[PDB]
User: Fold Carbonic anhydrase 2 from Homo sapiens.
Amino acid sequence: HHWGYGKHNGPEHWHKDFPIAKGERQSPVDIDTHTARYDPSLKPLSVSYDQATSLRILNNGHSFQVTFDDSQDKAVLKGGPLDGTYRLLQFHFHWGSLDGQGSEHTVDKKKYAAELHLVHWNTKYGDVGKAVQQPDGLAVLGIFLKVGSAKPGLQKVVDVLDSIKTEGKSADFTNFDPRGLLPESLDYWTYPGSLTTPPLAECVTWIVLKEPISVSSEQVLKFRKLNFNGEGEPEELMVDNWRPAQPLKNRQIKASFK
Ligand SMILES: C[C@]12CC[C@@H]3c4ccc(OS(N)(=O)=O)cc4CC[C@H]3[C@@H]1CCC2=O
Ligand SMILES: [Zn+2]
Assistant:
């Protein structure tokens, strides 16, 4: 019906409404670290978030997202494999019912407990709707989460999740600094791919950081208290909101690092 992550509407069903689900550059993928080629021509990523303006936090029935003002070049991604400048629109996460699954990308088949996606769009296309119709329209920065020590910079997010438990709910979420979610290293893998939820548009340059961040069990347990459902519907925990790895097909994953 309306798509989701369950047995009857999950990733294996998505191709019926979105036939590009079986396309040539679908995401996520398994990153086979020994086959990825070091590309010495790849530039360091430029992550310029000093002037980021967060606006809202929202439960959309498939994840939660923190939205940013993308009406000016305040929080931008450039360099790396990218041509031009990409504005930060939002970040969100994918996570599991248990710590051994939850990431969308895998690394030598290893699944992480969660994956953070910072979604940016190419300013040459003017708006994100236009950008999703272009093969170089979006750049998504992907960061793996493992469970161990807490991530202090994530705690402001975790603490408001009680206020957006169900689909439709949102809250003010100003002055959040996404730099507190980044690992030390910007070493990355990159490949051409797609959105990982409907409409699965093949518009994304994926930039996946090698270094995970650590979050605590308590932090990830708060993700797992969210609900896919609307407030007055049967409670169905928002867990396992990840798409599995898709066929690599005629693509090469490049590494920024040796
Ligand atoms: C809202 C949206 C549909 C959903 C699109 C989407 C879907 C999944 C998504 O997640 S992921 N995992 O691919 O980063 C990011 C976005 C950003 C652009 C979003 C689109 C911009 C215009 C539009 O109609
Ligand atoms: Zn995502």
Notes: The CA atoms of residues 192 and 205 lie 5 Å apart. The chain is about 10% helix and 30% strand.
